């Protein structure tokens, strides 16, 4: 029977990450279910062992999945991880693509925290999006995890904290729907851009849809140019009309951060915590689902 690491029975495909497909797995020794990411050993741009080293630098951080085993076998580099619960995109679909304000605010607090923690370990994520956050299991069911470090990179030197240099005219790789404006302009990404994408994720949870989502084109890049100029031609005040102003204040703050600015995470988290208490919700971690 098909086994990787001579211990993890391979199951159906359960998604597709960056530079690699994800499979359900079973630990035959424990009976525990796992996630298995595969990368063809003979790729010209190998990544999986880099991503697993980053996962190893990130361990201990709250909401970071554990790495069970990493190796090579057959046609694949193999990375085995802790299996988590549904993704935030899955759960958004589960709730008929509408979240309560309270759930948006509970998620926003935890997602800023995940991102700040990655930043404190000298890395930016660069693919902030609903599929890349997953809820925990059982006793960790109220905890938001961040996954997929296949596009992560150092934004600063690990000993001097010297920030990476500013660059322009980059053909960048991301998720078009959630990318920040600066990425659409070819600018080197940095801490500001993770939090800007979170802000679009928040408005996505709020609306069901984004104004630049579901556009018609033929070619791929000309579908990307249409997303880029609809996103840019949509003022934050018009995207966030009818909603509490904290979502616009959030997005406005992120676009006015400079390339190498350290974000004031505590300010942003406080924006949403203040509205949460003004609304009279209680931080009892009860999400919509």
């Amino acid at each position: 029977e098909l086994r990787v690491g001579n211990r993890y029975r391979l199951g159906r495909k359960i998604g597709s990450g960056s530079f690699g497909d994800i499979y359900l797995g079973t630990d035959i020794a424990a009976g525990e279910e796992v996630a298995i990411k595969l990368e063809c050993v003979k790729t010209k741009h190998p990544q999986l062992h880099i991503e697993s080293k980053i996962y190893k630098m990130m361990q201990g951080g709250v909401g970071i999945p554990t790495i069970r085993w990493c190796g090579a076998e057959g046609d694949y580099n193999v990375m085995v991880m802790e299996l988590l619960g549904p993704s935030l995109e899955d759960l958004f679909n589960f709730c008929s693509r509408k979240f309560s304000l309270k759930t948006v605010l509970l998620l926003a607090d935890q997602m800023i925290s995940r991102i700040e923690y990655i930043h404190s370990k000298n890395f930016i994520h660069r693919d902030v999006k609903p599929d890349n956050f997953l809820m925990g299991l059982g006793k960790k069911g109220n905890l938001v995890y961040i996954i997929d470090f296949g596009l992560a990179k150092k934004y600063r030197d690990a000993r001097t904290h010297q920030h990476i240099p500013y660059r322009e005219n980059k053909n960048l790789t991301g998720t078009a729907r959630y990318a920040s404006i600066n990425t659409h302009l070819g600018i080197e990404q940095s801490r500001r851009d993770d939090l800007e994408s979170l802000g679009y994720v928040l408005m996505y949870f709020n609306l069901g849809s984004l104004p630049w989502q579901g556009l018609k084109a033929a070619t791929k890049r000309q579908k990307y140019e249409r997303i880029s100029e609809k996103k840019m031609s949509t003022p934050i005040e018009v995207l966030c009309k009818g909603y509490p102003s904290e979502f616009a204040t959030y997005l406005n703050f992120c676009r006015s951060l400079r390339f190498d600015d350290k974000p004031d995470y505590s300010y942003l988290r406080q924006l949403f915590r203040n509205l949460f208490h003004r609304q009279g919700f209680s931080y009892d971690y009860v999400f919509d689902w």
Partner: peptide, 7 residues
Amino acid sequence: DSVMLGE
């Protein structure tokens, strides 16, 4: 193509 990883 808007939520696929791409360029």
